[PDB]
């Protein structure tokens, strides 16, 4: 019994997210509850809902109006539909299965929990196509100075300092995904304070998806 989720990956804000879960090694018509769960990057697990092959469904009350779960016996799949999606719905989405123990001909029990999961699929909700970052210097005031790389999309940005000639004391922080559906990140370097008067520091910012490349001098303001 293996589950494999599939679906787009990028969904525009206010659109609909649609995912499918393919079931193998078991019929969807079996005595199982087919579940959906998600997890925002770095946050906790949130239950979405579950469905039985007859159609009986339960949803997380926090999502009730936007969520629809369905079964497709013809393809041995079940589905998730989420409407009016916003950046808050960027998450890894998991399908999962829990057994329904019914000693009776038609009884539903909660004597087992979800015990089989799919690998999960990542869905990003954003309105931006491909956006290059703004780059601002973070002036020193040893000493720390850096560069702020603000509001880019999609994810991959890299930073170097003095074209890579500066290899020591560099700390580039992982990006935050903002509620606007754009990323920002910062890079900081620690240098001698007596050098700020004679040495130049330039942060080079490369945004691979947009082929943007920016050099920013950071001066002691």
């Amino acid at each position: 019994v293996q589950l494999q989720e599939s679906g787009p990956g990028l969904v525009k804000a206010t659109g609909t997210l649609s995912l499918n879960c393919a079931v193998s090694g078991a019929s969807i018509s079996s005595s199982n509850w087919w579940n959906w769960v998600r997890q925002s990057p770095g946050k906790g697990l949130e239950w979405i809902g579950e469905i039985y092959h007859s159609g009986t469904v339960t949803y997380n009350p926090s999502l009730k109006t936007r969520v629809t779960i369905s079964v497709d016996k013809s393809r041995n799949q079940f589905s998730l539909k989420l409407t009016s999606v916003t950046a808050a719905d960027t998450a890894k989405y998991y399908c999962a299965k829990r057994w329904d123990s019914s000693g009776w001909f038609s009884r539903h029990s909660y004597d087992y929990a979800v015990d089989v999961w799919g690998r999960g699929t990542t869905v990003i909700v954003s309105s931006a196509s491909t956006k290059g970052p703004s780059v601002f210097p973070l002036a020193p005031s040893t000493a720390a100075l850096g560069c702020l790389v603000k509001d880019y999309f999609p994810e991959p940005v890299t930073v170097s300092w003095n074209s890579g000639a500066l290899t020591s004391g560099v700390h580039t922080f992982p990006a935050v995904l903002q509620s606007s559906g754009l990323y920002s990140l910062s890079s900081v370097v620690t240098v001698p304070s007596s050098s700020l008067g004679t040495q130049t520091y330039i942060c080079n910012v490369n945004h691979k998806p947009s082929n943007t490349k920016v050099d920013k001098k950071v001066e002691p303001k």
Partner: protein, 210 residues
């Protein structure tokens, strides 16, 4: 109906630790099917214990479940380094399954270290672009659990705050960042802004001013 778990626990190799799981609706009973899930960094969650105390066939004998004082409990004995990760409880109420917020379990592997914090004001160039961002950079803390608060003057700030989850550095301590977006007028409205970082019950503060 909210399910409460400890935010973060620490334990040494070979130690023992108990996670608990409480419900805002009342005592947790066997009928709520309380279950426990382990999520190692980067992995899918993995059911360890279901229905209070039933193991899966892949669950190590080190893991055991119980009901204690109206709460569900998961005890880990003889902790091994690979047990580090996030643990979630799950309960059901009349058909609706609810996860707790999860507990980050650190298996201690080096001395505890307080964060170093650097706070940068908006740059001249950003202000001149009619924008403003405060950047709070937090590095070299261990264990990797931190809370970040902002003050505009002495008053707590909610809106415009976005913070990363801690990520592991090379040296196996942790880093995180927090950004506060505001208007140039708001920035110039106040005499200072602060970033407050709380780690193991201790708070570090940095302050910047227009």
């Amino acid at each position: 109906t909210v399910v409460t778990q400890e935010p973060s626990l620490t334990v040494s190799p070979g130690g023992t630790v108990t996670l608990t799981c409480a419900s805002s609706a009342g005592a947790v009973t066997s009928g709520h099917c309380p279950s426990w899930f382990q999520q190692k960094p980067g992995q899918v969650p993995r059911a360890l214990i279901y229905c209070t105390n039933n193991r899966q066939s892949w669950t190590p004998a080190r893991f055991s479940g119980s009901l204690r004082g109206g709460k569900a409990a998961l005890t880990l004995s003889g902790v091994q380094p690979d047990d580090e990760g996030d643990y979630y409880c799950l309960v059901q109420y009349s058909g609706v399954w609810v996860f707790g917020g999860g507990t980050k379990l650190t298996v201690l592997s080096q001395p505890k270290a307080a964060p170093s914090v650097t706070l940068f004001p908006p740059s001249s160039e950003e202000l001149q672009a009619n924008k403003a961002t405060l950047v709070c950079l937090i590095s070299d803390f261990y264990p990797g659990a931190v809370t970040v608060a902002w003050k505009a003057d002495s008053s707590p700030v909610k809106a415009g705050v976005e913070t990363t989850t801690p990520s592991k550095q090379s040296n196996n301590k942790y880093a995180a960042s927090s950004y506060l977006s505001l208007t140039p007028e708001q920035w110039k409205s106040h005499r200072s802004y602060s970033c407050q970082v709380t780690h193991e019950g201790s708070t570090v503060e940095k302050t910047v001013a227009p």
